[PDB]
Amino acid sequence: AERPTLPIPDLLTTDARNRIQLTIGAGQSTFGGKTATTWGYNGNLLGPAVKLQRGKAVTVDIYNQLTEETTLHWHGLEVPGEVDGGPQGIIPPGGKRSVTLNVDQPAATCWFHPHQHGKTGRQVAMGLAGLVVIEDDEILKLMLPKQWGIDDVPVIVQDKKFSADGQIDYQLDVMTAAVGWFGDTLLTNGAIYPQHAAPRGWLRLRLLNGCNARSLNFATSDNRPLYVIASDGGLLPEPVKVSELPVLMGERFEVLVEVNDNKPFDLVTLPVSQMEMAIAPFDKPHPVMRIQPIAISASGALPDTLSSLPALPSLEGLTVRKLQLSMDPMDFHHANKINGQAFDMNKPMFAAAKGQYERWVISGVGDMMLHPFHIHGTQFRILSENGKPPAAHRAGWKDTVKVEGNVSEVLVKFNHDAPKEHAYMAHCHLLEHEDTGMMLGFTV
Ligand SMILES: [Cu+2]
Ligand SMILES: [Cu+2]
């Protein structure tokens, strides 16, 4: 048995009447010979890549065929509260939901997943995640690698814990609420250590850390560089060459990597400093996927310049908001907090100004856990990350910011409304923390 081929999510576009159908359902997937019940969008596991065009409205019809309630959140999309599919956007079992997305942001890889209050971790663990590929008039002029599933590939990396029966083993209990749900089976687009057939020249990887709790650190088996071309919210001004790429839960980077000879190399994840994430088999470099070159040459290029990043404005005069994350020293369902309160679906913590720059200061000072802090409804600028100026590859458009025993500062603006009944969320994207209170709503 050769390694399995990397599964490629289907590139899903609008039909005749500008509609997209998404069915949330249960099926079966096989993992190392053993069948398991899994959940998928438009299939058994994970989901398709929804492809939107900047400025072209589309309607998404969502059918919930699960045995519990769900929501469908578009992680990274600047859309109104009413289509954002946070915990208020309940779709009951057997239920249907329609949403109009009017995409009004630069080209980027976003994603979608459940946001059910207290169940998100379980619902992502069982298999639900999809991709969103935004294109605009600018990115297509660049001549990047762009053959979907050939030289432009999504890489959804996820660990799972299985019971001896072969079934996914999720439980949100008093330890998971603290440290997060993780396992020793690493999945790459839902496959174990797949291989991807790549043409000579530039391979474009759209990396997503789709793990509940585990952070990742991408490198190559032979330490060839990754050229970072994009972050969560789209293109950097120019490529940032790195030898390793840390990626928090819920973050996307797009990287070019060279396929310059006929020899296979792996994309790996390196050991991380995170409570209990460096236990074997993550105590050494762990293979993510085998890149197998084909003698085909690909025309994609690494442009010396990608885009223009607008100047930071003056920070004098801007509203400051302080967000203190805290974990109850020892009811575990409400142990994690922001500003001393566990998520109340009913009571938004504050109202942001529409179209007005704000500085949000997020503080994990008082514990040493990793909190990838995610704000809905915006692509922001990181001003300070964990008490340093941001790394070059992290200094563009971001929807997540590291908070780990220190203080981060991001420049935020909300171009779209979110009323009380469909508030935006701001939360830790360690899903078990989210599910145990580490989240607020806010209005616009
Ligand atoms: Cu989000
Ligand atoms: Cu957290």
Automatic annotation (TrEMBL):
The gene is cueO. GO terms for molecular function: copper ion binding; oxidoreductase activity. It is found in: Periplasm. Monomer. PROSITE patterns: MULTICOPPER_OXIDASE2 (PS00080), TAT (PS51318). Pfam families: Cu-oxidase, Cu-oxidase_2, Cu-oxidase_3. It comes from the Bacteria. The lineage of its organism: Bacteria, Pseudomonadati, Pseudomonadota, Gammaproteobacteria, Enterobacterales. Keywords: Copper, Metal-binding, Oxidoreductase, Periplasm, Repeat, Signal. It catalyses: 4 Cu(+) + O2 + 4 H(+) = 4 Cu(2+) + 2 H2O. CDD domains: CuRO_1_CueO_FtsP, CuRO_2_CueO_FtsP, CuRO_3_CueO_FtsP. Its EC number is 1.16.3.4. SUPFAM superfamilies: Cupredoxins. Residues 27-137, 199-265, 331-444 form the Plastocyanin-like domain. One of its GO terms (cellular component) is periplasmic space. This is Multicopper oxidase CueO. It comes from Escherichia coli. Belongs to the multicopper oxidase family. Its cofactor is Cu cation.
